[PDB]
Amino acid sequence: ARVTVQDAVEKIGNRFDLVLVAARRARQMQVGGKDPLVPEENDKTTVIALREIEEGLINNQILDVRERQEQQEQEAAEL
């Protein structure tokens, strides 16, 4: 149950890229099957995405470097 996201607007430049990176994170988490890093409350993926965006441990650049390193390590394991 998320009621206020004003601090998220304070964190990211605007709401467009905010909801874009939130959608990418939710796609990589829910239909991606990966693991989160924030304690949940038996909820959906949207509100935990908003929570981990509000904290600051996940953003555009962090998602970019994470997916890049994942692709690199997958290519390395592929040999």
Partner 1 sequence: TTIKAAKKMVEREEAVVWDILDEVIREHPVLLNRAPTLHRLGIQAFEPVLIEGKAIQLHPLVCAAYNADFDGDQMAVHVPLTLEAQLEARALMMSTNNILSPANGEPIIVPSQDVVLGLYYMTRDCVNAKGEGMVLTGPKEAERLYR
Residue ranges in contact with partner 1 by CB under 8 A: 1-6, 15, 18-19, 22-23, 26-27, 30-31, 43-47, 49-50
Give the shortest CB-29-to-partner 1 separation in angstroms: 10
Other C-beta atoms closer than 10 Å to the C-beta of 31 total: 8
What is the distance between the terminal CA atoms of the chain, rounded to a whole angstrom? 45
> In terms of CB distance, is 56 or 74 closer to partner 1?
56
> In terms of CB distance, is 1 or 77 closer to partner 1?
1
